[PDB]
Amino acid sequence: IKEMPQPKTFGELKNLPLLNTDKPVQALMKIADELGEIFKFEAPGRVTRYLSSQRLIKEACDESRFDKNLSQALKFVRDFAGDGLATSWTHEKNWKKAHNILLPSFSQQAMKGYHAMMVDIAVQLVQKWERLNADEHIEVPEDMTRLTLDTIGLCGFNYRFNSFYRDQPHPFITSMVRALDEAMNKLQRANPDDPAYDENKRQFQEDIKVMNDLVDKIIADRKASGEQSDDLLTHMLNGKDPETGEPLDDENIRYQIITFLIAGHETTSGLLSFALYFLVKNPHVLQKAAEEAARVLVDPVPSYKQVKQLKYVGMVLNEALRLWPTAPAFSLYAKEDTVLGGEYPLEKGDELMVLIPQLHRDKTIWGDDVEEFRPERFENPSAIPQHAFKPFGNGQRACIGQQFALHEATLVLGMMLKHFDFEDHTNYELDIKETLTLKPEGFVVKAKSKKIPL
Numbered sequence: 001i002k003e004m005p006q007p008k009t010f011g012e013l014k015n016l017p018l019l020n021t022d023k024p025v026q027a028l029m030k031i032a033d034e035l036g037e038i039f040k041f042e043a044p045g046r047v048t049r050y051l052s053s054q055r056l057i058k059e060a061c062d063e064s065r066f067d068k069n070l071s072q073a074l075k076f077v078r079d080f081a082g083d084g085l086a087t088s089w090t091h092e093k094n095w096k097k098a099h100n101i102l103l104p105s106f107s108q109q110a111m112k113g114y115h116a117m118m119v120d121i122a123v124q125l126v127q128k129w130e131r132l133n134a135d136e137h138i139e140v141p142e143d144m145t146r147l148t149l150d151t152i153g154l155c156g157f158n159y160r161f162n163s164f165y166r167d168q169p170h171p172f173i174t175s176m177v178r179a180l181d182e183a184m185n186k187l188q189r190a191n192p193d194d195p196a197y198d199e200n201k202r203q204f205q206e207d208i209k210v211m212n213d214l215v216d217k218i219i220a221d222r223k224a225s226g227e228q229s230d231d232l233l234t235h236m237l238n239g240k241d242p243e244t245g246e247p248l249d250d251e252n253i254r255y256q257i258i259t260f261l262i263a264g265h266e267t268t269s270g271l272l273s274f275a276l277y278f279l280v281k282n283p284h285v286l287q288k289a290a291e292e293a294a295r296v297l298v299d300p301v302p303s304y305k306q307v308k309q310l311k312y313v314g315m316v317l318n319e320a321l322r323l324w325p326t327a328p329a330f331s332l333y334a335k336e337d338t339v340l341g342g343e344y345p346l347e348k349g350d351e352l353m354v355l356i357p358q359l360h361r362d363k364t365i366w367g368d369d370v371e372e373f374r375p376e377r378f379e380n381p382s383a384i385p386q387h388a389f390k391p392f393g394n395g396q397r398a399c400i401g402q403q404f405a406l407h408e409a410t411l412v413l414g415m416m417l418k419h420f421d422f423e424d425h426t427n428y429e430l431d432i433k434e435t436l437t438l439k440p441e442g443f444v445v446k447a448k449s450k451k452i453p454l
């Protein structure tokens with residue numbers, strides 16, 4: 001047995017003020033660099049332990065010993081994502097019911113059916129960049145968020161947010177972004193019942209009503225039409241769980257749609273933004289990826305099978321997820337008393353946080369070049385030890401969207417590399433904004449058309 005390290009304390013507030021920052025995950029990563037593979041974090045009324053090494057995270061990923069916990073972040077998101085897949089407990093009836101119903105809609109086979117709708121949004125992005133004037137620039141995370149939100153809207157419920165037609169977000173998105181901001185801000189809100197926050201609470205309830213009203217209306221409109229569009233909404237209205245024999249109820253369908261729109265806005269857009277950041281900072285990697293895109297994408301419109309052939313592009317995306325996993329942590333609880341790593345005794349109910357960026361910097365796994373962007377480290381994936389690479393979480397509670405997100409990101413990045421040369425015209429300094437997820441704020445490039453028609 002040994003006692004674990006703990007960062008600096010603030011009297012009665014214990015460690016809590018360490019997270020009073022716009023970049024709390026980055027602050028935790030610096031604490032992990034100082035303290036090592038495990039540290040205790042205390043706040044009034046709570047304790048958790050942050051894990052950074054593959055040695056300990058491999059044990060945390062044992063589903064016989066640990067289950068998914070709702071972090072306080074996810075408990076606050078649950079006020080609008082409800083018992084959708086990401087904000088439900090594994091033991092809630094609606095988790096396994098929705099998992100069984102939706103899993104076949106998210107398989108690699110299912111991606112063939114989404115491909116044409118993904119191409120529709122990807123072509124809108126390429127056309128926008130083709131239509132820029134000389135020495136205009138691209139706002140990268142802004143355009144990647146336009147793309148990923150519109151893709152999940154069109155695949156999620158046959159709804160066009162038309163983000164490439166707008167400066168100001170669709171009103172639904174204004175509300176969702178403000179609700180996510182309120183949820184994350186409440187983690188660092190000193191005394192939440194202060195009347196100073198009556199306005200924040202009124203605004204939060206208005207934002208919840210905006211999201212519910214659009215989504216409930218879309219569901220009610222589809223139910224009435226009987227239209228059988230092959231989207232997640234049709235799958236959810238029709239589908240029955242083989243175990244219970246029950247379908248999802250309309251309220252749970254609404255929470256699943258809200259969940260998918262949160263993920264589409266927050267995650268894939270960060271991955272695409274980081275991937276382009278690393279490509280412009282590593283011109284030899286950019287050249288290799290661009291050569292693959294030109295050799296494979298021989299038709300005006302990429303096919304499903306051609307996207308599967310963009311192997312190096314897939315390695316670039318995995319190497320971006322390694323260094324900056326855009327959903328940067330997940331939480332676990334001990335199912336029973338257990339000892340972690342032969343050293344750290346835990347009681348039933350004890351909470352763990354997995355710091356994915358730190359896991360992905362474990363030199364015992366990756367070697368001394370851990371900060372280098374080297375997609376070739378993914379060439380022989382059978383050599384990677386268990387639980388070393390976890391950008392999609394763990395086990396039965398891993399990301400249901402993994403195949404969707406990687407298909408969309410490989411398609412888009414392949415098209416971007418086929419159609420444009422890129423310049424880091426500002427010599428951009430990485431600045432990572434934290435929302436639910438991580439994204440590179442203020443990242444701009446210039447893109448010179450190779451003048452290849454669509």
Ligand SMILES: CCCCCCCN1CCC[C@H]1C(=O)N[C@@H](Cc1ccccc1)C(=O)O
Nearest residue numbers: 019024025071072073187327328329353436
């Ligand atoms: C994809 C979304 C991932 C969420 C990542 C968590 C993102 N938190 C943002 C702050 C740090 C990080 C985290 O470690 N929070 C924990 C612990 C905690 C609880 C209450 C207040 C502050 C912190 C939690 O939310 O329980």
Ligand SMILES: C=Cc1ccccc1
Nearest residue numbers: 077086259262263327
């Ligand atoms: C971490 C994934 C996630 C996805 C959607 C809503 C809340 C959380």
Ligand SMILES: [Cl-]
Nearest residue numbers: 009010011012
């Ligand atoms: Cl103290």
